[PDB]
Design a protein around this ligand. Structure first.
Ligand SMILES: [Mg+2]
Length: 470
RNA sequence: AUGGGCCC
RNA sequence: GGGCCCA
């Protein structure tokens, strides 16, 4: 985005924190080029000539403004995508009752009961349960007041900046490249769900290449689906963006909301309005306050859906800006936020597409090696989606989601106090797909101390999940 | 944190 | 309810 104003106020928002990630019995064994991100400015692991607060916000490098010609072309692409999207989902996009938007609906999880409540409730130390009844699907007086102030479109708010406590590659840990989370107030989240939840749930249950969205998918079973689909194309591309989320420009964001969430598609008028409040945002960070124009907040309801939509639109816009006759089935793609796979029988030149993405302030680079240039001729067994490869399971013939061994080692090397056993069982469902030998090697540091699920027990579970028959 | 999926 | 992983 674009930082337009930075001011210091007395009302402090404390987030400091040491890490909650302790090394495991495996860190002494795997020695991963990974560690927890730095969360204090006096971290000994930091480089010389690095400040946390400067690198934290160093992603906001400007809000790319668009020409009339480019704005109108984005609007056609947004309309054309919306058209395909709504024809597959239906136009059954009526608002959610308060109850619905809390407890969820078929294909939309229930709101989180005990996650951060956001501002200004965080400064009053009032937990999320203090404001909403998550059993009965009703809201307290403070939320109904904001709710009525959202219908009337007067509602203001500030985002709360959290430093993300997670494992990062040491190169980035040392560079102070800690990722940030932007917590919106819990009433904003509820109202957004009211406005676009019925859309969101329908997105989820219809995930696939057809709507170009993997949000709602389950890699274990859905890998076979995605695999076979992309298998039948002459060209496949693993495209990386660089800070996809922050680089969404006002114009693109705004135009996307105007074309996708139209009342003619059955959306409440305030659907467009609620989503547009994400464009110009106030972020709170200890003493400082940052007014930003552009970019997506990570923490808004429907963040992944918005990113995926925008992604689907970016590819169309970029291709149409370079070629002629390009229509939705000139190509195929699936995305989950920034993460994307594109395919086509045509020989598209992504290298030439670079500057077209650049007009939306997006920088595309090949995922593959970061090799000098986008190449042609790649297949699905060459690419990565959601940190998983597409590999053929040697004994069911089905595609399986395989994670890089180095990644799995990193994961297994750190855990929060008293969460190790639990975590080992979870990670096991991810590691099974690496094969018996590699499954054994990965968990061997934990032998004799924790319960390790057998390879066999988890392969058998997977086979049933992917196909009830074989 | 938003969410998705999964695990108990 | 508590956890994990991915974006
Ligand atoms: Mg990828």
């Amino acid at each position: 985005g674009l930082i337009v104003d930075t001011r210091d106020v007395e009302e402090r928002v404390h987030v400091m924190r040491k890490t909650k990630l302790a090394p495991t019995v495996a860190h002494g064994v795997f020695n991963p080029e990974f560690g927890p991100a730095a969360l204090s400015n006096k971290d000994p692991r930091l480089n010389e000539g690095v400040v946390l607060d400067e690198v934290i916000f160093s992603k906001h490098k400007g809000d790319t403004k668009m020409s009339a010609e480019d704005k109108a072309l984005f609007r056609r692409c947004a309309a054309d995508y919306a058209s395909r999207l709504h024809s597959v989902l239906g136009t059954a996009n009526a608002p959610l009752s308060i109850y619905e938007a809390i407890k969820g609906v078929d294909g939309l999880d229930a709101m989180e009961p005990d996650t951060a409540p956001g501002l200004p409730w965080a400064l009053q130390g009032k937990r999320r349960g203090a404001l909403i009844d998550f059993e009965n699907g009703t809201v307290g007086p403070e939320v109904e007041a904001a709710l009525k102030l959202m219908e009337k479109r007067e509602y203001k708010f500030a985002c709360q900046t959290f430093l993300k406590d997670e494992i990062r590659p040491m190169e980035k840990v040392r560079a102070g490249k800690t990722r940030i989370v932007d917590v919106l107030p819990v009433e904003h989240i509820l109202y957004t769900r009211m406005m676009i939840g019925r859309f969101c749930a329908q997105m989820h249950s219809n995930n696939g290449p057809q709507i170009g969205s993997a949000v709602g998918c389950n890699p274990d079973v859905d890998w076979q689906r995605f695999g076979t689909h992309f298998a039948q194309y002459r060209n496949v591309w693993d495209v990386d963006y660089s800070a996809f989320d922050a680089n969404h420009c006002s114009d693109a964001m705004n135009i996307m909301f105007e074309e996708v969430f139209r009342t003619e598609f059955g959306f409440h008028p305030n659907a467009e309005w609620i989503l547009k409040t994400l464009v110009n945002t106030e972020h709170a960070y200890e003493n400082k306050r940052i007014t930003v124009e552009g970019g997506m907040p990570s923490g808004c309801s429907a963040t992944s859906i918005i990113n995926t939509i925008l992604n689907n639109i970016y590819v169309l816009y970029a291709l149409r800006r370079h070629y002629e006759g390009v229509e939705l089935d000139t190509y195929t793609m699936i995305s989950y936020g920034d993460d994307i796979v594109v395919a086509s029988d045509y020989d598209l030149d992504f290298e030439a597409l670079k500057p077209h993405f650049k007009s939306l302030g997006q920088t595309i680079t090949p995922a593959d090696k970061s090799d000098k240039g986008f190449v042609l001729g790649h297949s699905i067994t060459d690419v990565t989606f959601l940190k998983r490869h597409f590999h053929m399971d040697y004994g069911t013939g089905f595609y399986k989601p395989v994670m890089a061994s180095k990644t799995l080692e990193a994961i297994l090397s750190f855990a929060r106090r008293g969460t190790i056993q639990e975590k080992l069982i979870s990670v096991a469902g991810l590691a099974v797909h690496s094969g018996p030998d590699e499954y054994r090697r990965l968990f061997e540091p934990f032998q004799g101390l924790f319960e390790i699920p057998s390879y066999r027990s988890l392969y058998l579970r997977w086979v049933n999940a992917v196909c009830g028959d074989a």
